[PDB]
């Protein structure tokens, strides 16, 4: 410390006798907090089956640190939807979350925080899956809002939305997923294809029967598929020119 000149912090760090009780209580705190985090992740993997959720605990721990990697992928599309991955750094009284896209969030030791966080991340996954699926099927992504700001107020976190268009024009598909009120999904037909559309006498040309004026809503149960993205893929294929 004399010749290689040290600051206050290194000097105090060399001489800091922390008792046995503080060390043992910090270890027991980390054990309990880590067990609670594992329990909430496994409870979400048991209860919710709609996206999916995975975990990969690290090989190496300290007495005051562990780590996971949480993926949230849909069931049969693990190459498409790889856009929501987390890393949690379970300290002594804090869980520090690093997202894939550079968002760092420090939670607290309660197990309601981690539950609401992972619920909001499943809700955002249900939209990023449709965006990267419309990337594959050639559909054109008209609008995408990661945290939408119109409509009813969601309790847990914000809600996300896209709208994509069919590659040959006519049909459109809008998804709005939220963590408490999930998946209001609705197609948009062209005009001259609703036929309950009350026509107006101002339109005197037939060129305006090609714009997509009407909007109907798909009932999401009774749609065939054992998944969400599977149902979206069947819905996207249904609104294509029937190639046979």
């Amino acid at each position: 410390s004399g010749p290689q000149a040290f600051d206050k912090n290194e000097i105090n760090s060399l001489q800091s006798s922390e008792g046995l009780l503080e060390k043992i209580i910090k270890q027991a705190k980390h054990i309990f907090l880590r067990s609670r985090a594992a329990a909430t992740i496994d409870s979400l993997a048991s209860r919710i089956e709609d996206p999916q959720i995975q975990a990969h605990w690290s090989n190496i721990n300290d007495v005051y640190e562990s780590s996971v990697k949480v993926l949230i992928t849909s069931q049969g599309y693990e190459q498409i939807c790889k856009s929501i991955q987390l890393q949690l750094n379970i300290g002594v009284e804090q869980i520090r979350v690093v997202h894939r896209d550079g968002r760092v969030i420090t939670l607290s030791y309660q197990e309601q925080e981690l539950q609401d966080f992972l619920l909001s991340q499943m809700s955002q996954h249900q939209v990023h899956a449709v965006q990267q699926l419309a990337k594959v099927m050639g559909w054109q992504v008209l609008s995408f809002s990661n945290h939408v700001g119109l409509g009813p107020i969601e309790s847990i976190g914000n809600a996300s939305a896209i709208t994509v268009a069919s590659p040959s024009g006519d049909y459109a598909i809008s998804v709005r997923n939220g963590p408490e009120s999930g998946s209001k999904i609705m197609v948009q037909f062209p005009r001259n294809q609703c036929k309950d559309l009350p026509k107006s006498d101002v339109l005197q040309d037939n060129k305006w029967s090609h714009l997509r004026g009407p909007f109907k809503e798909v009932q999401w149960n009774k749609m065939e598929g054992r998944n969400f993205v599977y149902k979206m893929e069947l819905l996207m294929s249904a609104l294509s020119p029937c190639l046979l």
Partner: protein, 99 residues
Amino acid sequence: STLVDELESSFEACFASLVSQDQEEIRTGVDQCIQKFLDIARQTECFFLQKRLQLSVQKPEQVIKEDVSELRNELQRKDALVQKHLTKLRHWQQVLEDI
């Protein structure tokens, strides 16, 4: 006609600049060939999905048969994993007993 054959023709068209007897010619040819190739691939996938949708609404017992098959493969795969793990555990018990 017969989207398979358009897929075959477009795939053979991707290679047409190489198999015969600078940069921008190669670039525009590659872009047009690859775009038509992927477009016909997506149309073929759309055809198979439309046919699967019509089967899943008309003849739903086939879907249940495939689900039965997949759950049975999940069962057999789980048992294979646990058997390999159990053999490794017994080997490690025999190792750790000998200290």
